[PDB]
Design an enzyme around this catalytic site. Structure first.
Site, short mmCIF file in Angstrom:
data_model
loop_
_atom_site.label_atom_id
_atom_site.label_comp_id
_atom_site.label_asym_id
_atom_site.label_seq_id
_atom_site.Cartn_x
_atom_site.Cartn_y
_atom_site.Cartn_z
N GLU A 162 0.82 -1.21 0.00
CA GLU A 162 0.00 0.00 0.00
C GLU A 162 0.86 1.26 0.00
O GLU A 162 0.59 2.20 -0.76
CB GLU A 162 -0.98 0.03 1.18
CG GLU A 162 -2.18 -0.92 1.07
CD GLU A 162 -3.17 -0.57 -0.04
OE1 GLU A 162 -3.04 0.49 -0.69
OE2 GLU A 162 -4.10 -1.38 -0.26
N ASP A 199 -5.90 8.73 -0.85
CA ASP A 199 -5.52 7.68 0.11
C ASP A 199 -4.32 8.12 0.95
O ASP A 199 -3.33 8.62 0.41
CB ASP A 199 -5.18 6.38 -0.63
CG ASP A 199 -6.33 5.88 -1.46
OD1 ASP A 199 -7.47 5.87 -0.95
OD2 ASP A 199 -6.09 5.49 -2.63
N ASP A 223 -11.35 9.98 -8.70
CA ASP A 223 -12.71 10.27 -8.25
C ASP A 223 -12.75 11.45 -7.27
O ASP A 223 -13.80 11.73 -6.68
CB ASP A 223 -13.32 9.02 -7.61
CG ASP A 223 -12.61 8.59 -6.32
OD1 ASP A 223 -11.54 9.15 -5.99
OD2 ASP A 223 -13.13 7.70 -5.62
N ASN A 254 -8.81 5.78 2.67
CA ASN A 254 -9.46 6.61 1.65
C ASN A 254 -10.33 7.72 2.23
O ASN A 254 -11.01 7.52 3.23
CB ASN A 254 -10.30 5.73 0.71
CG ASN A 254 -10.89 6.51 -0.45
OD1 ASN A 254 -12.10 6.75 -0.49
ND2 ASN A 254 -10.04 6.92 -1.39
N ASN A 259 -6.79 9.82 -6.09
CA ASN A 259 -7.51 9.02 -7.08
C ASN A 259 -8.30 9.90 -8.04
O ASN A 259 -8.54 11.08 -7.76
CB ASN A 259 -8.45 8.04 -6.38
CG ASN A 259 -7.72 7.10 -5.45
OD1 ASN A 259 -8.08 6.97 -4.28
ND2 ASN A 259 -6.69 6.44 -5.96
N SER A 314 -11.09 11.57 -4.45
CA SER A 314 -10.67 11.11 -3.13
C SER A 314 -9.16 10.90 -3.09
O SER A 314 -8.50 10.81 -4.13
CB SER A 314 -11.41 9.82 -2.75
OG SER A 314 -10.91 8.70 -3.48
N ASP A 338 -15.66 -3.57 8.96
CA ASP A 338 -16.81 -3.08 8.18
C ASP A 338 -17.67 -4.17 7.54
O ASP A 338 -18.78 -3.90 7.07
CB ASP A 338 -16.34 -2.08 7.11
CG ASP A 338 -17.51 -1.31 6.47
OD1 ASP A 338 -18.28 -0.67 7.22
OD2 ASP A 338 -17.64 -1.33 5.23
#
Lengths: 129, 105
Positions: A35, A52, A48, A59, A46, A50, A101
């Protein structure tokens, strides 16, 4: 900060990641490797809108707040900048929420692609823990 | 002309030994997970039954499917076509080519 492998393994064990949600320590070390390359300051935008953040690349849509991501849920209740410290406390706490989650470690694409189903314990082999 | 596909498998039939098989599942959205680069929709077709994981991954999943994912809510009625992929850990998931929303909750 860029952690060494066994240094991070020891820190993650101290922060209670070993067997958290059934995931052995090697999974977490391997995840961080692919990562962030063990870099606590790793940040990646990213397409979109967003971003990280940190050692485990958390995120900015659902998990942390960076003040620039539309539809921010901030489920970890933390500024994303706090995930960039040399101390991994904040990333570990948020990672613990993420992995709880309902999808386990499948939340991490680097873990899915590089760690899942491999000899992950190799990532902690030889480490003083 | 496009038409939504006929269900081929019940969610409980999605097993690791179907790895590489194209399937069509149909049911409701049990849960949604958005982790950024990975997004997951779970589909159920029974109460107290399976909730099969359908994963979307940036750069691999067609971008139009992320647009459909953004429309999804729990309890939405969906038809999903994709390829069964058995877990590398060795339990099962679906890599989608089609996500149809039949009705919103």
């Amino acid at each position: 900060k860029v952690f060494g492998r066994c240094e991070l393994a020891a820190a993650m064990k101290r922060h209670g990641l070993d067997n958290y949600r059934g995931y052995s320590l090697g999974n977490w070390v391997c995840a961080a490797k692919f990562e962030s390359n063990f870099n606590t300051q790793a940040t990646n935008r990213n397409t979109d809108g967003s971003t990280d953040y940190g050692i485990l690349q958390i995120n900015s849509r659902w998990w942390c707040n960076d003040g620039r991501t539309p539809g921010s849920r901030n489920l970890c209740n933390i500024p994303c900048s706090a995930l960039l410290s040399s101390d991994i406390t904040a990333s570990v706490n948020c990672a613990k929420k993420i992995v709880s989650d309902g999808n386990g470690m499948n939340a991490w694409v680097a873990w899915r692609n590089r760690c899942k189903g491999t000899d992950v314990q190799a990532w902690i082999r030889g480490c003083r823990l | 002309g496009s038409v939504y596909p006929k269900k081929t498998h019940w969610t409980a039939e999605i097993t690791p030994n179907l790895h590489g098989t194209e399937v069509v599942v149909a049911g409701w959205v049990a849960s949604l997970g958005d982790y950024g680069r990975v997004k997951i929709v779970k589909v159920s077709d029974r109460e107290g039954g399976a909730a099969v994981s359908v994963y979307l991954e940036y750069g691999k999943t067609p971008d139009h499917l992320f647009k459909v994912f953004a429309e999804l809510s729990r309890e939405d009625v969906v038809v999903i076509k994709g390829i069964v992929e058995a877990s590398k850990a060795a339990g099962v998931e679906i890599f989608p080519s089609e996500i149809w929303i039949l009705n919103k909750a």
